[PDB]
Amino acid sequence: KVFERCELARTLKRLGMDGYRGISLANWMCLAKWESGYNTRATNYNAGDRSTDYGIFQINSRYWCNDGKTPGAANAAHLSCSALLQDNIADAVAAAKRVVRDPQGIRAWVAWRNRCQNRDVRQYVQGCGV
C-alpha cells in the first residue's frame, strides 16, 4: 500500500507515535517519506552486508526482524520480516518503536540525519488535522 501523506499522519497518531521516546510525529513522517515514499511493500537489498530493509520504515533484517537468509542476524523486534510488508502497519510501528528504544533513537536511520535532522519538518504534517 502507498499511503497518502495525511492519511499516514493520522494513522501514526492513532498508533501512539506522537512523542514516542521524544520523537515528534513530523519526524516519523519525515523518516517514512525518505525511507520508502510511504510504501509498505518497499524492500531494499544491501549487497555489501547481505541484509535487506523491509517496509515503510525500512527496518533491517540483521537486527530487528528475521528473514532467514541474513548472515549473523538477530531479531530484536521479534518478528518475521514478512510482517513488515503488510498494508496494515501495526507490526511495522511496533518494530520502529523497538528500534528507537536503543540509545541512538531515531538517529539509527542514516536517512534521518541527512534529510530530517536540524530541518523544518512541519511540512510533513501541515494540514492533516493531527
Swiss-Prot record:
The keyword Signal is assigned to this record: yes
Catalytic residue list: E35, D53
CDD domains attached to this UniProt entry: LYZ_C (cd16897)
Keyword Hydrolase part of the UniProt annotation: yes
Top-rank EC class of the record's enzyme: hydrolase
Top-level taxon of the source organism: Eukaryota
Enzyme Commission number: 3.2.1.17
Cellular localisation: Secreted
SMART domains assigned: LYZ1
SUPFAM superfamilies: Lysozyme-like
GO MF entries: identical protein binding; lysozyme activity
Xref: Pfam families: Lys (PF00062)
PROSITE patterns named among the record's database cross-references: GLYCOSYL_HYDROL_F22_1 (PS00128), GLYCOSYL_HYDROL_F22_2 (PS51348)
Annotated disorder: Amyloidosis, hereditary systemic 5: A form of hereditary systemic amyloidosis, a disorder characterized by amyloid deposition in multiple tissues resulting in a wide clinical spectrum. AMYLD5 primarily affects the viscera, and the predominant clinical features are renal dysfunction of varying severity, and intra-abdominal bleeding. Inheritance is autosomal dominant.
Subunit (UniProt): Monomer.
Family according to the record: Belongs to the glycosyl hydrolase 22 family.
Protein name, as recorded: Lysozyme C
Species of origin: Homo sapiens (Human)
